[PDB]
Amino acid sequence: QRFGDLVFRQLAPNVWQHTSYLDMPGFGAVASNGLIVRDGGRVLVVDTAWTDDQTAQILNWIKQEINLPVALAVVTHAHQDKMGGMDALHAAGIATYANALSNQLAPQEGMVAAQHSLTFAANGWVEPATAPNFGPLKVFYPGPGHTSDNITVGIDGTDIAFGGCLIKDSKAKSLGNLGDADTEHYAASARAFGAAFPKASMIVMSHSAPDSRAAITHTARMADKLR
């Protein structure tokens, strides 16, 4: 339609969460979150919706609500929830980025790859040459947890960090879908995320409402029971 079926919640003066819902037989209405970030006179987008239509809606909300050009998007992992609307971005002329491993996994997940691949220093930090002018966006790769390619981003100046599918809600009873999980490293990855963004007080979840640092702690402890 025109942004009418996605939820957009203000999370900081310059940050908003986009939530869209899957409509697929055999599935419930499943929420997926990404972020929208105003960085001065430009917007940056973390993730897409399930479909191009939902993703197009996000662009419209930006256009109506913010009215600043959309400079880039990053996708945090390869699956329908975050990568589904890739082509909506390219159709719009938006430069997209993903972990190299993600772009390579996109086809086997039935998704279109981002235009550009991110490579990471052994630090776990993205190579500034592969992610030019990301501004406040700070991109960390903790290693394999929930999936092999899961990346996470921090938002400078807000004390918000986005954990992807990595961090589950502090009320989570399980780690969920351990199909692409890495049994051995999942606890260390979770904790490395926490050290990576030591100041962030709000942890945006992939599916649920934003949480505190306790979710990080909860996750790691659940993953200790994997080994």
Side-chain angles (χ1 to χ4, degrees), residues 87-118:
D87 265 339
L89 308 166
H90 315 143
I94 304 165
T96 53
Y97 299 76
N99 200 2
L101 173 63
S102 275
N103 289 337
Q104 171 177 1
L105 288 179
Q108 304 122 68
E109 236 63 32
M111 303 287 87
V112 157
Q115 289 172 16
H116 309 281
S117 292
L118 302 167

PDB file of all heavy atoms in Angstrom, residues 87-118:
ATOM      1  N   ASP A  87      15.992  -6.310  -3.330  1.00  0.00           N
ATOM      2  CA  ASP A  87      15.822  -5.694  -4.636  1.00  0.00           C
ATOM      3  C   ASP A  87      15.037  -4.365  -4.597  1.00  0.00           C
ATOM      4  O   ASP A  87      15.314  -3.433  -5.364  1.00  0.00           O
ATOM      5  CB  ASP A  87      15.343  -6.709  -5.676  1.00  0.00           C
ATOM      6  CG  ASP A  87      16.509  -7.291  -6.443  1.00  0.00           C
ATOM      7  OD1 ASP A  87      17.577  -6.633  -6.457  1.00  0.00           O
ATOM      8  OD2 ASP A  87      16.389  -8.388  -7.021  1.00  0.00           O
ATOM      9  N   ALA A  88      14.104  -4.252  -3.667  1.00  0.00           N
ATOM     10  CA  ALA A  88      13.472  -2.955  -3.448  1.00  0.00           C
ATOM     11  C   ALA A  88      14.547  -1.844  -3.278  1.00  0.00           C
ATOM     12  O   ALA A  88      14.464  -0.790  -3.960  1.00  0.00           O
ATOM     13  CB  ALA A  88      12.515  -3.019  -2.254  1.00  0.00           C
ATOM     14  N   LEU A  89      15.558  -2.097  -2.418  1.00  0.00           N
ATOM     15  CA  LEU A  89      16.697  -1.161  -2.238  1.00  0.00           C
ATOM     16  C   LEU A  89      17.429  -0.841  -3.540  1.00  0.00           C
ATOM     17  O   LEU A  89      17.526   0.349  -3.914  1.00  0.00           O
ATOM     18  CB  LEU A  89      17.703  -1.630  -1.161  1.00  0.00           C
ATOM     19  CG  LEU A  89      17.123  -2.003   0.228  1.00  0.00           C
ATOM     20  CD1 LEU A  89      18.148  -2.760   1.078  1.00  0.00           C
ATOM     21  CD2 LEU A  89      16.496  -0.806   1.010  1.00  0.00           C
ATOM     22  N   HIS A  90      17.909  -1.884  -4.239  1.00  0.00           N
ATOM     23  CA  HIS A  90      18.545  -1.689  -5.566  1.00  0.00           C
ATOM     24  C   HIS A  90      17.635  -0.998  -6.583  1.00  0.00           C
ATOM     25  O   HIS A  90      18.103  -0.195  -7.401  1.00  0.00           O
ATOM     26  CB  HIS A  90      19.153  -2.988  -6.157  1.00  0.00           C
ATOM     27  CG  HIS A  90      19.950  -3.774  -5.164  1.00  0.00           C
ATOM     28  ND1 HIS A  90      19.962  -5.156  -5.135  1.00  0.00           N
ATOM     29  CD2 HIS A  90      20.739  -3.375  -4.134  1.00  0.00           C
ATOM     30  CE1 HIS A  90      20.732  -5.569  -4.147  1.00  0.00           C
ATOM     31  NE2 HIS A  90      21.216  -4.507  -3.521  1.00  0.00           N
ATOM     32  N   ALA A  91      16.341  -1.282  -6.533  1.00  0.00           N
ATOM     33  CA  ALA A  91      15.450  -0.631  -7.496  1.00  0.00           C
ATOM     34  C   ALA A  91      15.427   0.867  -7.174  1.00  0.00           C
ATOM     35  O   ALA A  91      15.222   1.689  -8.064  1.00  0.00           O
ATOM     36  CB  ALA A  91      13.994  -1.275  -7.501  1.00  0.00           C
ATOM     37  N   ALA A  92      15.672   1.211  -5.903  1.00  0.00           N
ATOM     38  CA  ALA A  92      15.608   2.615  -5.447  1.00  0.00           C
ATOM     39  C   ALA A  92      16.917   3.376  -5.668  1.00  0.00           C
ATOM     40  O   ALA A  92      16.953   4.606  -5.562  1.00  0.00           O
ATOM     41  CB  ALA A  92      15.185   2.706  -3.968  1.00  0.00           C
ATOM     42  N   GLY A  93      17.986   2.634  -5.966  1.00  0.00           N
ATOM     43  CA  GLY A  93      19.316   3.206  -6.109  1.00  0.00           C
ATOM     44  C   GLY A  93      20.129   3.280  -4.819  1.00  0.00           C
ATOM     45  O   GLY A  93      21.060   4.070  -4.734  1.00  0.00           O
ATOM     46  N   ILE A  94      19.784   2.453  -3.826  1.00  0.00           N
ATOM     47  CA  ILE A  94      20.469   2.418  -2.537  1.00  0.00           C
ATOM     48  C   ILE A  94      21.598   1.372  -2.497  1.00  0.00           C
ATOM     49  O   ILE A  94      21.389   0.185  -2.784  1.00  0.00           O
ATOM     50  CB  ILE A  94      19.498   2.136  -1.346  1.00  0.00           C
ATOM     51  CG1 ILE A  94      18.355   3.146  -1.299  1.00  0.00           C
ATOM     52  CG2 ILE A  94      20.259   2.190  -0.004  1.00  0.00           C
ATOM     53  CD1 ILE A  94      17.232   2.726  -0.409  1.00  0.00           C
ATOM     54  N   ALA A  95      22.779   1.842  -2.104  1.00  0.00           N
ATOM     55  CA  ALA A  95      23.966   1.014  -1.987  1.00  0.00           C
ATOM     56  C   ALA A  95      23.804   0.104  -0.786  1.00  0.00           C
ATOM     57  O   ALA A  95      23.605   0.587   0.316  1.00  0.00           O
ATOM     58  CB  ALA A  95      25.192   1.891  -1.811  1.00  0.00           C
ATOM     59  N   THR A  96      23.904  -1.206  -0.993  1.00  0.00           N
ATOM     60  CA  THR A  96      23.676  -2.152   0.085  1.00  0.00           C
ATOM     61  C   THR A  96      24.962  -2.914   0.497  1.00  0.00           C
ATOM     62  O   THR A  96      25.873  -3.114  -0.306  1.00  0.00           O
ATOM     63  CB  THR A  96      22.536  -3.146  -0.289  1.00  0.00           C
ATOM     64  OG1 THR A  96      22.828  -3.751  -1.556  1.00  0.00           O
ATOM     65  CG2 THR A  96      21.243  -2.438  -0.412  1.00  0.00           C
ATOM     66  N   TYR A  97      25.004  -3.360   1.749  1.00  0.00           N
ATOM     67  CA  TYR A  97      26.181  -4.008   2.280  1.00  0.00           C
ATOM     68  C   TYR A  97      25.745  -5.224   3.085  1.00  0.00           C
ATOM     69  O   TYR A  97      24.644  -5.229   3.683  1.00  0.00           O
ATOM     70  CB  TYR A  97      26.976  -3.040   3.165  1.00  0.00           C
ATOM     71  CG  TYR A  97      27.475  -1.798   2.449  1.00  0.00           C
ATOM     72  CD1 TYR A  97      26.604  -0.765   2.144  1.00  0.00           C
ATOM     73  CD2 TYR A  97      28.819  -1.646   2.110  1.00  0.00           C
ATOM     74  CE1 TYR A  97      27.036   0.372   1.488  1.00  0.00           C
ATOM     75  CE2 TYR A  97      29.269  -0.518   1.465  1.00  0.00           C
ATOM     76  CZ  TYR A  97      28.355   0.500   1.151  1.00  0.00           C
ATOM     77  OH  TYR A  97      28.735   1.651   0.489  1.00  0.00           O
ATOM     78  N   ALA A  98      26.594  -6.258   3.063  1.00  0.00           N
ATOM     79  CA  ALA A  98      26.428  -7.470   3.873  1.00  0.00           C
ATOM     80  C   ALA A  98      27.781  -8.141   4.065  1.00  0.00           C
ATOM     81  O   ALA A  98      28.685  -7.946   3.258  1.00  0.00           O
ATOM     82  CB  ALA A  98      25.433  -8.447   3.237  1.00  0.00           C
ATOM     83  N   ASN A  99      27.902  -8.909   5.149  1.00  0.00           N
ATOM     84  CA  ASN A  99      29.037  -9.791   5.386  1.00  0.00           C
ATOM     85  C   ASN A  99      29.285 -10.587   4.133  1.00  0.00           C
ATOM     86  O   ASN A  99      28.331 -11.067   3.508  1.00  0.00           O
ATOM     87  CB  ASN A  99      28.682 -10.769   6.503  1.00  0.00           C
ATOM     88  CG  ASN A  99      29.931 -11.394   7.170  1.00  0.00           C
ATOM     89  OD1 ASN A  99      31.075 -11.073   6.817  1.00  0.00           O
ATOM     90  ND2 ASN A  99      29.702 -12.281   8.141  1.00  0.00           N
ATOM     91  N   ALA A 100      30.544 -10.719   3.724  1.00  0.00           N
ATOM     92  CA  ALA A 100      30.832 -11.540   2.529  1.00  0.00           C
ATOM     93  C   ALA A 100      30.119 -12.876   2.646  1.00  0.00           C
ATOM     94  O   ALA A 100      29.449 -13.290   1.710  1.00  0.00           O
ATOM     95  CB  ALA A 100      32.330 -11.753   2.324  1.00  0.00           C
ATOM     96  N   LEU A 101      30.233 -13.534   3.805  1.00  0.00           N
ATOM     97  CA  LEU A 101      29.670 -14.859   3.943  1.00  0.00           C
ATOM     98  C   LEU A 101      28.186 -14.847   3.679  1.00  0.00           C
ATOM     99  O   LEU A 101      27.659 -15.817   3.127  1.00  0.00           O
ATOM    100  CB  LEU A 101      29.961 -15.483   5.313  1.00  0.00           C
ATOM    101  CG  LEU A 101      29.211 -16.812   5.484  1.00  0.00           C
ATOM    102  CD1 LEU A 101      29.680 -17.885   4.458  1.00  0.00           C
ATOM    103  CD2 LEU A 101      29.381 -17.320   6.859  1.00  0.00           C
ATOM    104  N   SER A 102      27.519 -13.763   4.095  1.00  0.00           N
ATOM    105  CA  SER A 102      26.097 -13.525   3.802  1.00  0.00           C
ATOM    106  C   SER A 102      25.754 -13.514   2.304  1.00  0.00           C
ATOM    107  O   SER A 102      24.935 -14.324   1.848  1.00  0.00           O
ATOM    108  CB  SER A 102      25.619 -12.212   4.428  1.00  0.00           C
ATOM    109  OG  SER A 102      25.225 -12.369   5.783  1.00  0.00           O
ATOM    110  N   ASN A 103      26.382 -12.600   1.555  1.00  0.00           N
ATOM    111  CA  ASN A 103      26.234 -12.527   0.093  1.00  0.00           C
ATOM    112  C   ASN A 103      26.399 -13.856  -0.618  1.00  0.00           C
ATOM    113  O   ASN A 103      25.685 -14.173  -1.580  1.00  0.00           O
ATOM    114  CB  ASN A 103      27.225 -11.541  -0.485  1.00  0.00           C
ATOM    115  CG  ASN A 103      26.860 -10.146  -0.153  1.00  0.00           C
ATOM    116  OD1 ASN A 103      25.692  -9.890   0.125  1.00  0.00           O
ATOM    117  ND2 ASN A 103      27.838  -9.221  -0.155  1.00  0.00           N
ATOM    118  N   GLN A 104      27.368 -14.625  -0.143  1.00  0.00           N
ATOM    119  CA  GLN A 104      27.598 -15.947  -0.662  1.00  0.00           C
ATOM    120  C   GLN A 104      26.466 -16.892  -0.224  1.00  0.00           C
ATOM    121  O   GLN A 104      26.062 -17.782  -0.961  1.00  0.00           O
ATOM    122  CB  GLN A 104      28.962 -16.447  -0.210  1.00  0.00           C
ATOM    123  CG  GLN A 104      29.187 -17.888  -0.531  1.00  0.00           C
ATOM    124  CD  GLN A 104      30.586 -18.406  -0.142  1.00  0.00           C
ATOM    125  OE1 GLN A 104      31.434 -17.681   0.405  1.00  0.00           O
ATOM    126  NE2 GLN A 104      30.816 -19.668  -0.439  1.00  0.00           N
ATOM    127  N   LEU A 105      25.924 -16.698   0.968  1.00  0.00           N
ATOM    128  CA  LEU A 105      24.831 -17.579   1.362  1.00  0.00           C
ATOM    129  C   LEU A 105      23.476 -17.168   0.780  1.00  0.00           C
ATOM    130  O   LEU A 105      22.548 -17.964   0.820  1.00  0.00           O
ATOM    131  CB  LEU A 105      24.712 -17.671   2.886  1.00  0.00           C
ATOM    132  CG  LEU A 105      25.767 -18.455   3.670  1.00  0.00           C
ATOM    133  CD1 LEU A 105      25.427 -18.372   5.186  1.00  0.00           C
ATOM    134  CD2 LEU A 105      25.868 -19.919   3.175  1.00  0.00           C
ATOM    135  N   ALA A 106      23.353 -15.939   0.275  1.00  0.00           N
ATOM    136  CA  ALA A 106      22.036 -15.416  -0.161  1.00  0.00           C
ATOM    137  C   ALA A 106      21.303 -16.357  -1.131  1.00  0.00           C
ATOM    138  O   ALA A 106      20.153 -16.713  -0.867  1.00  0.00           O
ATOM    139  CB  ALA A 106      22.144 -13.988  -0.763  1.00  0.00           C
ATOM    140  N   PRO A 107      21.970 -16.759  -2.247  1.00  0.00           N
ATOM    141  CA  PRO A 107      21.375 -17.684  -3.225  1.00  0.00           C
ATOM    142  C   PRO A 107      20.750 -18.957  -2.606  1.00  0.00           C
ATOM    143  O   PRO A 107      19.582 -19.292  -2.883  1.00  0.00           O
ATOM    144  CB  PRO A 107      22.560 -18.030  -4.129  1.00  0.00           C
ATOM    145  CG  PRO A 107      23.440 -16.791  -4.094  1.00  0.00           C
ATOM    146  CD  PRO A 107      23.271 -16.225  -2.715  1.00  0.00           C
ATOM    147  N   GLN A 108      21.498 -19.660  -1.767  1.00  0.00           N
ATOM    148  CA  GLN A 108      20.981 -20.892  -1.164  1.00  0.00           C
ATOM    149  C   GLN A 108      19.850 -20.642  -0.161  1.00  0.00           C
ATOM    150  O   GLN A 108      19.173 -21.590   0.271  1.00  0.00           O
ATOM    151  CB  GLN A 108      22.108 -21.696  -0.494  1.00  0.00           C
ATOM    152  CG  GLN A 108      23.246 -22.028  -1.427  1.00  0.00           C
ATOM    153  CD  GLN A 108      24.583 -21.489  -0.942  1.00  0.00           C
ATOM    154  OE1 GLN A 108      25.115 -21.943   0.070  1.00  0.00           O
ATOM    155  NE2 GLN A 108      25.134 -20.521  -1.674  1.00  0.00           N
ATOM    156  N   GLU A 109      19.686 -19.383   0.250  1.00  0.00           N
ATOM    157  CA  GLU A 109      18.542 -18.983   1.067  1.00  0.00           C
ATOM    158  C   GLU A 109      17.405 -18.384   0.204  1.00  0.00           C
ATOM    159  O   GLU A 109      16.357 -17.998   0.736  1.00  0.00           O
ATOM    160  CB  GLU A 109      18.968 -17.999   2.156  1.00  0.00           C
ATOM    161  CG  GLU A 109      18.614 -18.440   3.573  1.00  0.00           C
ATOM    162  CD  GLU A 109      19.320 -19.723   3.976  1.00  0.00           C
ATOM    163  OE1 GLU A 109      20.458 -19.942   3.502  1.00  0.00           O
ATOM    164  OE2 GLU A 109      18.733 -20.508   4.757  1.00  0.00           O
ATOM    165  N   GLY A 110      17.617 -18.333  -1.120  1.00  0.00           N
ATOM    166  CA  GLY A 110      16.654 -17.793  -2.061  1.00  0.00           C
ATOM    167  C   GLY A 110      16.563 -16.279  -2.022  1.00  0.00           C
ATOM    168  O   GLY A 110      15.515 -15.708  -2.308  1.00  0.00           O
ATOM    169  N   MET A 111      17.654 -15.622  -1.665  1.00  0.00           N
ATOM    170  CA  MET A 111      17.643 -14.176  -1.513  1.00  0.00           C
ATOM    171  C   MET A 111      18.582 -13.561  -2.520  1.00  0.00           C
ATOM    172  O   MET A 111      19.500 -14.212  -2.969  1.00  0.00           O
ATOM    173  CB  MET A 111      18.159 -13.781  -0.129  1.00  0.00           C
ATOM    174  CG  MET A 111      17.424 -14.369   1.051  1.00  0.00           C
ATOM    175  SD  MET A 111      15.821 -13.609   1.269  1.00  0.00           S
ATOM    176  CE  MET A 111      14.798 -14.627   0.181  1.00  0.00           C
ATOM    177  N   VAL A 112      18.373 -12.294  -2.831  1.00  0.00           N
ATOM    178  CA  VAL A 112      19.329 -11.554  -3.612  1.00  0.00           C
ATOM    179  C   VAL A 112      20.435 -11.035  -2.700  1.00  0.00           C
ATOM    180  O   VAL A 112      20.164 -10.606  -1.570  1.00  0.00           O
ATOM    181  CB  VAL A 112      18.643 -10.383  -4.349  1.00  0.00           C
ATOM    182  CG1 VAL A 112      19.638  -9.273  -4.703  1.00  0.00           C
ATOM    183  CG2 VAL A 112      17.940 -10.896  -5.602  1.00  0.00           C
ATOM    184  N   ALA A 113      21.681 -11.122  -3.186  1.00  0.00           N
ATOM    185  CA  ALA A 113      22.855 -10.564  -2.506  1.00  0.00           C
ATOM    186  C   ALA A 113      22.861  -9.039  -2.499  1.00  0.00           C
ATOM    187  O   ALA A 113      22.320  -8.391  -3.403  1.00  0.00           O
ATOM    188  CB  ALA A 113      24.203 -11.095  -3.122  1.00  0.00           C
ATOM    189  N   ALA A 114      23.480  -8.480  -1.458  1.00  0.00           N
ATOM    190  CA  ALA A 114      23.808  -7.066  -1.439  1.00  0.00           C
ATOM    191  C   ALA A 114      24.809  -6.741  -2.538  1.00  0.00           C
ATOM    192  O   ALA A 114      25.498  -7.643  -3.073  1.00  0.00           O
ATOM    193  CB  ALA A 114      24.378  -6.664  -0.066  1.00  0.00           C
ATOM    194  N   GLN A 115      24.896  -5.453  -2.875  1.00  0.00           N
ATOM    195  CA  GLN A 115      25.853  -4.980  -3.886  1.00  0.00           C
ATOM    196  C   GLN A 115      27.324  -5.142  -3.448  1.00  0.00           C
ATOM    197  O   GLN A 115      28.178  -5.521  -4.262  1.00  0.00           O
ATOM    198  CB  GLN A 115      25.590  -3.508  -4.241  1.00  0.00           C
ATOM    199  CG  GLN A 115      24.311  -3.243  -5.047  1.00  0.00           C
ATOM    200  CD  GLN A 115      24.000  -1.753  -5.200  1.00  0.00           C
ATOM    201  OE1 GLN A 115      24.865  -0.889  -4.978  1.00  0.00           O
ATOM    202  NE2 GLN A 115      22.765  -1.446  -5.586  1.00  0.00           N
ATOM    203  N   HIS A 116      27.589  -4.840  -2.169  1.00  0.00           N
ATOM    204  CA  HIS A 116      28.930  -4.824  -1.602  1.00  0.00           C
ATOM    205  C   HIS A 116      29.057  -5.812  -0.417  1.00  0.00           C
ATOM    206  O   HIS A 116      28.084  -6.018   0.340  1.00  0.00           O
ATOM    207  CB  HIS A 116      29.315  -3.415  -1.120  1.00  0.00           C
ATOM    208  CG  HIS A 116      29.111  -2.326  -2.129  1.00  0.00           C
ATOM    209  ND1 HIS A 116      29.997  -2.081  -3.159  1.00  0.00           N
ATOM    210  CD2 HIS A 116      28.150  -1.373  -2.232  1.00  0.00           C
ATOM    211  CE1 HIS A 116      29.582  -1.042  -3.860  1.00  0.00           C
ATOM    212  NE2 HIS A 116      28.457  -0.597  -3.325  1.00  0.00           N
ATOM    213  N   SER A 117      30.257  -6.402  -0.270  1.00  0.00           N
ATOM    214  CA  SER A 117      30.579  -7.344   0.821  1.00  0.00           C
ATOM    215  C   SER A 117      31.425  -6.671   1.903  1.00  0.00           C
ATOM    216  O   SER A 117      32.325  -5.882   1.605  1.00  0.00           O
ATOM    217  CB  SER A 117      31.347  -8.568   0.300  1.00  0.00           C
ATOM    218  OG  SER A 117      30.554  -9.416  -0.538  1.00  0.00           O
ATOM    219  N   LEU A 118      31.180  -7.022   3.143  1.00  0.00           N
ATOM    220  CA  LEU A 118      31.978  -6.505   4.236  1.00  0.00           C
ATOM    221  C   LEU A 118      33.004  -7.540   4.665  1.00  0.00           C
ATOM    222  O   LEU A 118      32.709  -8.717   4.797  1.00  0.00           O
ATOM    223  CB  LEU A 118      31.122  -6.095   5.440  1.00  0.00           C
ATOM    224  CG  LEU A 118      30.001  -5.059   5.351  1.00  0.00           C
ATOM    225  CD1 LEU A 118      29.182  -5.124   6.584  1.00  0.00           C
ATOM    226  CD2 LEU A 118      30.473  -3.673   5.089  1.00  0.00           C
TER     227      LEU A 118
END
